[PDB]
């Protein structure tokens, strides 16, 4: 077998003259970080991950991890696939490694606080150690200040930081004060300071000269795994189990030596931990490496780099420039960003202009009509401001590009409207835009005006009847229709060519209320796709087809947290979202699940606006009687060097099966697949068949608890299950050009207890299917899923005993439908349900036929076969039937690290016999977690927690081990295999994901 790609825990990262070197599983990855290009992947260790690495000035790399250490040439790492022959194994765990000052020796710190001085073949020359009783270390570093001044800085499990002089073997300090084990120690470059961190969640700054504690910093919310000084020892950066990277100021004064002060918090990795960090002082950039396999680049000067990121003005500042013109209780009530800066309007209808160039405010004009609750809208790209009020009045003003002179103005009143409570605008075409106005009277009209971009005159006015439960919240135009977002998750589509035509009404798209954005995505044939966001966090992608219109939901999901106020696609095709999490504005890359920026607004955040500008966005908002301008610049470097996968266990993996349907040509070089994680999400992505490179599309968040199973049951349907009887049927759409879409089709009825497993059998032509589920309480249920009424009907229920049931599988042999379970007692138990369900089995390829009878709940019959196989729980269950579907061979992997092969047969009289064919008692060193039959049952691939992938062959019902290979994926627990046309692709899941070829 050959390993192709790996995404998983990346324990360390180093900046090196325009490279990032990342310890990435057992490899080093070398990136050109300005372009985010992966130059090479070089395997350094046979199986151990790289915990630490450092570079000599002359390009030698010292790397260590667990008991492995190696010295390797940067030039070889740049071009070779593997350098594992240079790996050496030390007898003890290696806590740290540094080059000697002249790079002629290396110093290895063991977990027992001994230093091994080695030559550059990693051979020991001598050892240094302290006197006294042993210390066990969870961290430590060797800090080389000069040729003969080497400090060993040891973080013990007991919570002391021992700092001692290497060559004299002399204790300098025993820094006490932490409450837990010490998980990282670092020293400032200028020799002034020690920093340590623990699982007490504190960072402690120590005086390296006096050994006194200077400052204790409490900010991180979980254990801290790494920290270091940067920016000439004026700042500290830390990285944590809480998935944040935190920057601290070292504030030096006379009266207190120095103190830590929190400066910035960056949430940068997926749940959970962050292991590695490094800073490039010149550019003030950081790099972090996560348990999720993400490598994140952080602009440490997001708020300062260009010098205009943050600005605020109170009404007094503004009055200092416009003059004392504001009345008692007058405040800014609307604002828009244009090329020149801001146009704002006050509660008394004063229209103000802020120039981004001169930084000056000035009064432009007053329109007393708009002292009656003015609303502000705009067409940013065309420098058009739109003012409305509650008295059916409208004011349009157009501004010159740089000058900001008023070059067009129009005003009008709409007699159709009594009171007006909502005004929306959207772009229409090269010459005009649309404006809608609504009133709360149910009998008044919904008014849409088409307005010239050139002189702001009305080209046409349309008046529509409002459907019953309709309050417009957002607006987009498409061809000759307007799509109007409404409350209650309603979307109303009107036809601008025929205001008497009945509107097309999409009700209840999501559980939420206000529709916040409608955005055109793509079109194909006679269908157009739209993104529709909802304030309460839900977003839906709908497909509008011209056949009269019809619609289908292609995608549905919920943001992790907070209000969702809009979403758009960037030039890379990534879904970008924005909204609020309580008082915090967010801009979030929802495709790859990382935050782009955030801002503390006014809690209630009643007045805010976001606008796109060249090289970023401007966020405008009112907070605490101040008008704030936050410029959100595109990062000076790429956001990530790897996007990453889950940062917790991957419990299941499913590849979308090949089909005769019209899967889009973009996916032709690879496969769409799902990972299901204990982090409670399902991630839908793609991998390239040749390179194993993985790309993310979506992170589905419906499940409330950790996933157990996900399986594509055919080319467009997928079932997942977790606990709380969460079982969801999903529908996938892969017909469009850039990404697949997935939406929930139905959830299983619920009776706490878990759905441990399921299996399905399709009902011939139907797209209906039978579903069996087994539960923690030993119950068994059989369901009929019917497409047209989109529901699950319970047709059978029963119980095995009381113990948990881990796996279940449908087996169709001859004209019988069999159910096979594997309880925790280690038995294989067979049920023949044929007589008790209104379905028939076709004798070959075993297809179900619907008898179209009414739904009765049968009781589960007594088992027809009970064979003991394993001495404990059965973790993996697979089967393959023979060519005549008269028998099946059943493969089981056990918690007893045994591998079982059993035979299920029907005789001429249809009597079921289950007999065991072979049992390998020591098939693995630990729990066997996956066991799949391939090549018509001739071969077996197994996975187990010992991180050894085993390939087997079956000859005459007997198993023999034919190949084995280690993976870095710890806690190896999921496996998926697909044939290419036989050569196979293996997806290997646990903590991390690896793709292999066989």
């Amino acid at each position: 077998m050959k390993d192709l790609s790996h995404y998983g825990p990346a324990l360390c990262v180093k900046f090196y003259n325009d490279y990032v070197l990342a310890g990435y599983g057992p490899f080093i990855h070398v990136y050109d970080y300005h372009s985010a290009t992966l130059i090479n992947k070089c395997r350094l260790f046979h199986y151990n991950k790289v915990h630490g690495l450092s570079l000599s000035s002359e390009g030698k790399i010292l790397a260590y991890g667990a008991r492995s250490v190696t010295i390797v040439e940067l030039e070889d790492v740049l071009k070779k696939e593997s350098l594992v022959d240079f790996e050496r194994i030390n007898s003890d765990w290696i806590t740290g490694a540094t080059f000697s000052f002249d790079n002629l020796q290396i110093y290895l710190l063991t977990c027992y606080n001994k230093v091994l001085i080695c030559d550059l073949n990693c051979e020991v020359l001598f050892r240094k150690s302290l006197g006294g009783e042993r210390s066990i270390l969870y961290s430590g570093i060797i800090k080389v200040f000069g040729p003969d001044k080497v400090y060993v800085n040891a973080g013990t499990v007991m919570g002391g930081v021992i700092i001692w002089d290497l060559f004299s073997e002399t204790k300098i300090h025993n820094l006490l004060g932490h409450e837990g084990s010490i998980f990282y120690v670092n020293l400032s470059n200028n020799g002034r300071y020690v920093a340590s961190c623990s699982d007490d969640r504190s960072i402690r700054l120590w005086d390296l000269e006096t050994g006194k504690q200077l400052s204790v910093g409490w900010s991180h919310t979980a254990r801290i795994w790494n920290l270091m000084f940067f920016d000439n020892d004026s700042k500290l950066i830390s990285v944590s189990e809480d998935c944040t990277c935190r920057v601290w100021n070292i504030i030096e004064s006379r009266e207190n030596v120095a103190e830590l002060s929190i400066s910035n918090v960056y949430e940068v990795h997926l749940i959970k931990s962050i292991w590695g960090v490094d800073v490039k002082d010149d550019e003030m950039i950081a790099v972090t490496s996560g348990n999720d396999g993400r490598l994140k680049l952080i602009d440490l000067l997001q708020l300062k780099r260009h010098g205009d990121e943050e600005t605020s003005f109170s009404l007094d500042d503004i009055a200092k420039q416009c003059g004392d013109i504001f009345e008692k209780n007058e405040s800014i009530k609307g604002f828009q960003w244009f090329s020149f800066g801001v146009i704002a309007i006050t509660s008394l209808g004063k229209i103000l202009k802020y120039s981004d160039v001169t930084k000056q405010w000035k009064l432009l004009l007053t329109n007393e009509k708009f002292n009656s609750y003015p609303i502000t809208n705009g067409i940013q790209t065309q420098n058009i401001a739109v003012f409305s009020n509650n008295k059916s009045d409208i004011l349009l003003i157009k501004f010159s590009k740089d000058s900001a002179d008023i070059i067009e103005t129009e005003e009008f009143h709409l007699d159709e409207l009594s009171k007006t409570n909502n005004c929306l605008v959207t772009e229409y075409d090269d010459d005009s835009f649309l404006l809608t106005l609504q009133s709360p009277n149910p009998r008044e009209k919904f008014v849409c005006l088409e307005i010239s971009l050139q002189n702001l005159k009305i080209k046409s006015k349309h008046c529509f009847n409002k459907p019953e439960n309709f309050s417009s919240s957002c607006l987009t135009s498409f061809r000759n229709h307007i799509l109007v977002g409404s409350r209650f998750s309603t979307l109303v589509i009107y036809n601008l060519l025929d205001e008497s035509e009945e509107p097309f009404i999409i009700r209840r798209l999501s559980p939420g209320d206000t529709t916040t954005s409608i955005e055109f995505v793509e079109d194909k044939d006679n269908s157009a796709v739209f993104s529709v966001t909802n304030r309460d966090g839900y977003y839906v992608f709908i497909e509008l087809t011209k056949n009269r219109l019809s619609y289908k939901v292609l995608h549905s999901n919920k943001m992790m947290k907070g209000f969702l106020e809009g979403a758009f696609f960037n030039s890379k095709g990534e879904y970008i979202t924005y909204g609020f999490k309580s008082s915090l504005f967010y801009l979030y890359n929802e495709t790859n699940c990382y935050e782009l920026a955030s801002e503390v607004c006014g809690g209630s955040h009643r007045l805010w606006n976001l606008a796109k500008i060249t090289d970023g966005h401007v966020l405008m908002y009112i907070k605490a009687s101040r008008f704030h301008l936050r410029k959100i610049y595109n990062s000076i470097v790429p956001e990530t060097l790897e996007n990453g996968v889950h940062g917790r266990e991957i419990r299941d993996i499913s590849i979308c099966p090949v089909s005769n349907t019209n899967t889009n040509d973009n996916f032709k070089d690879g496969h769409i697949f799902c990972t299901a994680s204990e982090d409670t999400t399902i991630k839908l992505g793609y991998f390239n068949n040749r390179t194993g490179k993985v790309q993310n599309f979506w992170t589905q968040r419906k499940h409330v608890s950790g996933l157990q199973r996900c399986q594509f049951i055919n080319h467009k349907l997928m079932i997942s299950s977790s606990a709380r009887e969460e079982l969801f049927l999903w529908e996938l759409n892969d017909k469009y050009n850039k990404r697949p879409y997935m939406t929930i089709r139905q959830a299983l009825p619920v009776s706490d207890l878990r759905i441990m497993d399921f299996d399905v059998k399709f009902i011939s032509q139907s797209g209906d299917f039978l579903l069996v589920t087994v539960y923690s309480d030993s119950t068994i249920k059989i369901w009929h899923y019917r497409e047209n009424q989109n529901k699950f009907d319970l047709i059978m229920q029963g119980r095995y005993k009381t113990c948990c049931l881990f796996n279940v599988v449908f087996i169709a042999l001859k004209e019988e439908l069999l159910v096979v379970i594997s309880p925790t007692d280690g038995h294989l138990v067979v049920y023949n349900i044929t007589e008790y369900v209104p379905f028939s089995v076709d004798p070959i390829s075993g297809d179900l036929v619907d008898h179209k009878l009414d739904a009765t709940i049968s009781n589960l019959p007594a088992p027809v076969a009970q064979l003991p196989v394993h001495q404990s729980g059965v973790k993996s269950l697979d089967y393959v039937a023979n060519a005549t579907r008269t028998s099946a061979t059943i493969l089981t992997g056990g918690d007893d690290n045994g591998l079982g092969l059993s035979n299920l047969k029907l005789d001429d009289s249809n009597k079921v016999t289950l007999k065991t064919s072979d049992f390998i008692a020591a098939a693995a060193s630990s729990t066997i977690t996956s066991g799949m039959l391939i090549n018509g049952g001739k071969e077996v691939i197994t996975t187990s927690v010992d991180q050894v992938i085993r390939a087997w062959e079956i000859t005459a019902g007997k198993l023999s081990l034919v190949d084995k290979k280690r993976t870095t994926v710890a806690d190896t627990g999921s496996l998926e295999i697909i044939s290419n046309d036989s050569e196979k692709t293996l997806l290997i899941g646990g903590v991390g994901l690896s793709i292999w070829k066989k």
Partner: protein, 231 residues
């Protein structure tokens, strides 16, 4: 959070882990022996295995087999007292901690030494497994002495990538090495227990058992026998 956390509070056990030692003894039956007399619980905090030892050896035993029975439970952290248990706050490596344990028996070797100790996992599996092997090794050197020849030693293990090294590092010292999950052991944990039966012949800041078992063993892996435990 689950079933056993609930029934631990119902039975007055300090932790759900109490059922792991009970579900263990539902076979091996090393605590159902009337002849069983002296036991040591290492890294016992907060003490639920010592409660189980107390209930089985005293509350649930005829007065006829309660004589010279002595339960010592050791942890560096201080423990709330348990009826019929001498709790020692000591380091399993320190001096008199074998001498003091020596004295609380009549210079008799223990029938049975158990340890359910484990640090909180970090999520870094290679570190978590290595640290767990450390605890077992250091626990093993007290068990090397105080254990009666032919007496069982029970310890919690991290049943991961390098467990097979521990099994054969442990071959030199036991008649039958067994490995068991109970059923109160969470499916989401890499947990298992190494139930070492029939203590066989041992040997005859400095050198420790971890480096001298690393000395002889070295880089070899064997697979111990497996045994489910509960009913």
């Amino acid at each position: 959070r689950d079933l056993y956390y609930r029934k631990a509070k119902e039975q007055g056990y300090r932790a759900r882990s109490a059922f792991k030692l009970l579900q263990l003894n539902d076979q091996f039956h090393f605590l159902d022996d009337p002849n069983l007399k002296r036991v040591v619980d290492l890294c016992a905090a907060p003490g639920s295995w010592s409660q189980v030892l107390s209930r089985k050896l005293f509350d649930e035993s005829p007065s006829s087999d309660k004589e010279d029975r002595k339960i010592v439970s050791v942890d560096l952290q201080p423990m709330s007292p348990i009826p019929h248990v001498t709790t020692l706050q000591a380091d399993i490596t320190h001096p008199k901690t074998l001498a003091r344990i020596l004295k609380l028996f009549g210079n008799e070797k223990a029938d049975f030494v158990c340890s359910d100790g484990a640090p909180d996992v970090t999520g870094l599996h290679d570190l978590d497994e290595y640290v767990q092997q450390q605890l077992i090794m250091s626990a093993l050197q007290l068990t090397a002495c105080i254990l009666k020849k032919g007496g069982t030693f029970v310890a919690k293990i991290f049943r991961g990538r390098d467990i097979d090294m521990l099994y054969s590092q442990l071959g030199y010292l036991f008649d039958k090495i067994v490995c068991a999950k109970p059923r109160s052991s969470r499916g989401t944990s890499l947990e298992a227990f190494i139930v070492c039966l029939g203590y066989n012949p041992p040997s005859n800041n400095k050198l420790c058992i971890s480096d001298k078992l690393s000395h002889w063993n070295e880089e070899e892996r064997n697979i111990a026998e497996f045994m489910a435990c509960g009913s």
